[PDB]
Amino acid sequence: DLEDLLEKIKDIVLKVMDIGDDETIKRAQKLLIKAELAVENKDLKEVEKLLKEAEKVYKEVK
Amino acid sequence: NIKETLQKIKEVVLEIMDKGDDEQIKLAQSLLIVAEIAVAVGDKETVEKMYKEAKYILDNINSITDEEIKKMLEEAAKIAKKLLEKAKDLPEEERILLRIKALVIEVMAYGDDETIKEAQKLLIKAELAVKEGDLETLKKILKEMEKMVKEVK
Ligand SMILES: N[C@]12C[C@H]3C[C@H](C[C@H](C3)C1)C2
Ligand SMILES: N[C@]12C[C@H]3C[C@H](C[C@H](C3)C1)C2
């Protein structure tokens, strides 16, 4: 359940790291650790919106 | 006690990435990593020290000197390689993941920015492989970690 969204956002950060600039990478890691926080504290709404924002930064690096 | 301390460490790290500069966040992420290392082995005094050091960075966010960021990077490396010794009663997968993490820290110590990027991408990949139980890729990821920690030695 939550680990699936964790996998999605972790994949997203891993691919943001391959071409993006330093600010994009730092924001991706920010979203990653915010996710990790929410997933440890059990809050599906948070992890979902963090996944949304991660796909959003991926769309920022078209 | 350890599960409530790593989370405060993560919170401090996020605030640092809000405030700090590339070297300071480099240090802080290395801290978070060796902290997770210590959590995997049951060493709580280490993680207490880690929270203390990260909060020290946060406090002296405009007075810390790159010389002492480097002292702490080297020290975090040494500590992670020492904590790896308590990881001999867990599955081979988490052991190789722990060694990968420690090598990533040692790269963050002396490696340049692009090398740290590569090491963090490989660390993420190892975090995925752990959830997939894939031995054949995390073994080669650890070997590629090794073909890096000395490549920048
Ligand atoms: N788990 C990690 C969070 C953040 C991004 C990446 C490298 C470091 C810092 C550890 C994965
Ligand atoms: N300059 C960098 C800052 C931060 C840490 C490391 C990797 C990324 C994110 C670029 C160096």
Helix, strand and coil content of chain B, in percent to the nearest 5, comes to 85, 0, 15
User: Which ligand does the CA of B118 lie closest to?
Assistant: 2
Gap between the Cα atoms of A16 and A60, Å rounded: 10
Q: Whose CA is nearest to atom 5 of ligand 2?
A: B26
Q: From the CA of B91, how far away is ligand 2's center (Å)?
A: 32
Mutate to test the interface with A, among B121, B132, B137 (most CBs of A within 10 A): B121
Rounded Cα distance between A62 and B4, Å, is: 38
- Supply φ then ψ for residue B25, to 5 degrees: -70, -35
The identity of residue B112, as a single letter, is D
Contacts 24+ apart (CB under 8 A), B74-77: B74/B109, B76/B27, B76/B30, B76/B31, B76/B34, B76/B105, B76/B109, B77/B30, B77/B102, B77/B105, B77/B106, B77/B109
Close Cβ partners of A51 (under 8 Å, ≥ 6 residues apart):
A5, A8, A9, A12, A35
Chain A residues with CB under 8 Å of B14 CB are: 30, 33-34, 37
Tokens read off for B122: 């490989």
Q: How long, in residues, is chain B?
A: 153
Which DSSP string do the residues of B23-61 spell out, in sequence order? HHHHHHHHHHHHHHHHHHHT-HHHHHHHHHHHHHHHHTT
CA distance B153 to B149: 6
Start-to-end Cα distance in chain B? 37
Phi and psi at B112, nearest 5°, equal -80, 175
CB-CB contact of B138 with B91 (8 Å): no
- d(CA B31, CA B53) in angstroms, rounded, equals 8
DSSP class of A62? -
Q: Are B24 and B82 in contact (CB under 8 A)?
A: no
Tokens of A20: 């993006």
Length of chain A as a residue count = 62
Query: What is the token pair recorded at A25?
Result: 């990478």
Eight-state DSSP code of residue B151: T
CA atoms within 13 A on the CB side of B65: 2
Experimental method of this PDB entry: X-ray
What is the C-alpha separation between B87 and B134, in angstroms, rounded? 19
Q: Report yes or no: B38 and B83 within 8 Å, Cβ to Cβ.
A: yes
| Tokens found for residue A41 | 């504290």
**Is the CB of B10 inside 8 Å of chain A's CB atoms?**
yes
Report the alpha-carbon distance of residue B103 to residue B97 in Å, rounded: 10
Q: Per CB distance under 8 Å, which residues of A are interface residues toward B?
A: 3, 7, 10-11, 13-14, 17-18, 22, 25-26, 29-30, 33-34, 36-37, 40-41
